[PDB]
Amino acid sequence: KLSEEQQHIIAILLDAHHKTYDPTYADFRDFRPPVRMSPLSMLPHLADLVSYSIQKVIGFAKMIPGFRDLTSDDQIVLLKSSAIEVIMLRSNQSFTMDDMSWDCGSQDYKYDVTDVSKAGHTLELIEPLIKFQVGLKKLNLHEEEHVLLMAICIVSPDRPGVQDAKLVEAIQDRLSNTLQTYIRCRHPPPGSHQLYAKMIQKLADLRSLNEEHSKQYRSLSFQPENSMKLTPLVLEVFGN
Numbered sequence: 001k002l003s004e005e006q007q008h009i010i011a012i013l014l015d016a017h018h019k020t021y022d023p024t025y026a027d028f029r030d031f032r033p034p035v036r037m038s039p040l041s042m043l044p045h046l047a048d049l050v051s052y053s054i055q056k057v058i059g060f061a062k063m064i065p066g067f068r069d070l071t072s073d074d075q076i077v078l079l080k081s082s083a084i085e086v087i088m089l090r091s092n093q094s095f096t097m098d099d100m101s102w103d104c105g106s107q108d109y110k111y112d113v114t115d116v117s118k119a120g121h122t123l124e125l126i127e128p129l130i131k132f133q134v135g136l137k138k139l140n141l142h143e144e145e146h147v148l149l150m151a152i153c154i155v156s157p158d159r160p161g162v163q164d165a166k167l168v169e170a171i172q173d174r175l176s177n178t179l180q181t182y183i184r185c186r187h188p189p190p191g192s193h194q195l196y197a198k199m200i201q202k203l204a205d206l207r208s209l210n211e212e213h214s215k216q217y218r219s220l221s222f223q224p225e226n227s228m229k230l231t232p233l234v235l236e237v238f239g240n
C-alpha cells in the first residue's frame, strides 16, 4: 500500500542517516580525551560528542525531503529546538539495556549514568532520560521507523518561533503519514500494535526532556568557566 514517493522518502532518510551516523564511531577519537576519576571531568569530552552530533543532525536535516523548501529562518528555528531531542533519539541506537549505558565500541567510549552525572547534570534529568532510552528501545523500531521519527521530530509546526507552520506541517504530515502506512504494511504484529501512537508519545517525552534541559543548561552556562569548556557550536545552538 506504499506509494513510490513514500518508498522514496524511506530511501532518502535511510541513506541520509547512514551519511550522518557512524556505527564505528571512529570520529570519537578526535574529541578531547574523557576523564573518569572529578568535578565535571567529563564535560570536555561529552561537550564535543554533542557538538559533533549537532553537526550530524544538521546534515541529516538538510536531506529531509522538503526541508530545503523551508525558509532559512524556520530551518534555524526547527534545528535549534530539535537538536537536543534528535540527539537523545539517535543516541538510542547505541544505547544498551544490558547495563543501561551508551556503548560506542571500546569501553573507552562507553558512557553510563556516572559519566552523564560527571558532566554537570543531576539525576533529575538523567533518570527520565534513561527511562526514555529504555522505553524507546523496547519499541524495537525498524531503521525505517527510526529515521522517520527523527525527521518528524525536526519539522514540527509548534516549535516556538516558526512562521511558516503550515508548510512545516505539510512536510511533517507527509512524513508522518509515511510512518503510519509503513507500520501497517512493513511492521507485522504484535510489534505493530499501537506502534505509531507509542512513537508519537516519545516525541511528547522529548518535549519534556528538552524543557528540563534548556533549563538545566542555563544554570550550567551561568558560570563562564563551564561555558568555557563547551564548543562555539554548542553555545550558538543552545542559546547564549
Ligand SMILES: C=C1/C(=C\C=C2/CCC[C@]3(C)[C@@H]([C@H](C)[C@H](CCO)CCCC)CC[C@@H]23)C[C@@H](O)C[C@@H]1O
Pocket: 046, 049, 050, 053, 087, 088, 090, 091, 092, 093, 094, 095, 102, 104, 111, 116, 119, 121, 125, 126, 129, 209, 210, 213, 217
Ligand atoms: C551523542 C550520541 C551518543 C550518546 C549520547 C549520550 C551519551 C553521553 C551523554 C549525552 C551526551 C547526554 C547529555 C549529558 C545531555 C545533554 C547536555 O547538553 C544531558 C541532558 C539529558 C536531557 C545526551 C545524550 C547523551 C553516541 C551515539 O549514539 C551517537 C549520538 O549522537
